[PDB]
Design a protein around this ligand. Sequence first.
Ligand SMILES: CO[C@@]1(C)[C@H](O)C(=O)C(C)=C2NC(=O)c3c(C)cc(O)c(C)c3O[C@@H]21
Lengths: 297, 277
Amino acid sequence: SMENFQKVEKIGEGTYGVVYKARNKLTGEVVALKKIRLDTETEGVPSTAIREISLLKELNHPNIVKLLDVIHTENKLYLVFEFLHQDLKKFMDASALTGIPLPLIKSYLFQLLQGLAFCHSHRVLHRDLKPQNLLINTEGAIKLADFGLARAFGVPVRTYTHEVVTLWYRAPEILLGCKYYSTAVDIWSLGCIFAEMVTRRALFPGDSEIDQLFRIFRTLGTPDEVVWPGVTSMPDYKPSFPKWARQDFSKVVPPLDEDGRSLLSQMLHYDPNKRISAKAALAHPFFQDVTKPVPHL
Amino acid sequence: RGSPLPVLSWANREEVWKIMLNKEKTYLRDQHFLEQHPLLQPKMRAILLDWLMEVCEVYKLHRETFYLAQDFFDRYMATQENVVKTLLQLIGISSLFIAAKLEEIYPPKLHQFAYVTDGACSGDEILTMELMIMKALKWRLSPLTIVSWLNVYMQVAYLNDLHEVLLPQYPQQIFIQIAELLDLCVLDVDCLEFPYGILAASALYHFSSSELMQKVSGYQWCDIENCVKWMVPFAMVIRETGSSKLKHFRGVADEDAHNIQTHRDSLDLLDKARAKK
Ligand SMILES: CO[C@@]1(C)[C@H](O)C(=O)C(C)=C2NC(=O)c3c(C)cc(O)c(C)c3O[C@@H]21
């Protein structure tokens, strides 16, 4: 129970519960504690908590937050995690005045792709890669956290939950209502996060399903049958859609070189079968000599 | 044992295959686990699982949901001793509750799991038991089920020229026919002697050939020989009665219906299979 742990302060409240900073009484180790209340749950232990726990028991990787323990006390579940200092959303908003330095953008993207490559080889979709869910420490590492929206996919897949991923980061095939989706939706979100780090603002800040679609077309061009076979027959697609045209990536992401516009445009490729994998993205020349710097917090 | 998977564009197939094999290794099953419950008899496990299949069909739950529940039940009972038969219903229905919350988009509400027990198990009792099960399993709730192996084998078998192994591309009849034999086998606790991938490879063998089994599973004959022989009277009983036809389910596309767990009364078939050897 909360014997072996001494709470120190509430430090946030994700959509799942309150996050506490705490200290192991025996080792003095500092940890984070996610509280999952059970007396407010008519369905017992939330499916998102069962998924998150059982998946993080299977996923030990340097760029995935480590689940240290699960404590059942009173009508609460306490998820003990390794402690990281800051999420990427709050880190950018504090660095938005100067932007986030570019050598860090190379490392953070590189590491997020080893975390993601690992998930996909274990057949896990994250399905909520947004900056608030990516956790950084003082030592420069970044890790995937909050697997509550995750799902292990079968071989083959079936139709999974529609409308996953926070809207600003949701891949277009989900928005068009595709029957099937898999690893490509995580890549899309990492592209959105890549370009949000560079320009300091969100890449596709829509505020509705159809509005989020249009922010993507305005920037990448309205897709067609040549660039994305089968697209006009997808269920959420209408012919009334306004035909925009692609933008130079010097204009969408000025601070980016040729390698950056290359890798980025591959992550935002419309056709999910032609979209770049995390395994391939790690090999792209952009990570020729990738570095590991310490952030300013 | 060879890698049957094709070149995958989302991850290296040598690693994906390695992670799958290590999974089957670290998830443990014990064909003798009822020996820790001397008041219980294997037939009671058959009755319980047969009933969970029936419930799954009523609610249109997925075959993977049923086999998750089966695995959770068998693995949990191996962690306990001296369970009385009047508790098996609660354990089974709570395993299915856990499995459905893991696997289904829109799982039935708690009050339906309690409802199908006709008053034997309240909602509160199911919530108590699900925590007992998950804690006793140490939250190891992501096995490779018997039917997931069948899904992999079917995908590999019907790999076309796209090699996009994640889009379903196998026909429905061969899948439900083999699932129907696995659904009869799993009711015999003796099936746990065999790793799940071998149960699925052996059942597939009995509906096809050595050449197909080997091509889609990477097993050699010697690895599955004992399971194949154990399975012979089960295959025969299924052949004798005929393979079920493909059901239709409300709200389920006909092209997806083979994924829904089906049920028929199977206990007489089971005794018939166990009588032959
Ligand atoms: C970085 O801190 C927090 C409060 C961040 O600001 C934030 O917004 C959210 C939503 C957080 N959620 C967590 O669940 C979590 C986790 C798994 C591990 C961990 O070590 C911390 C400090 C955590 O707390 C972060």
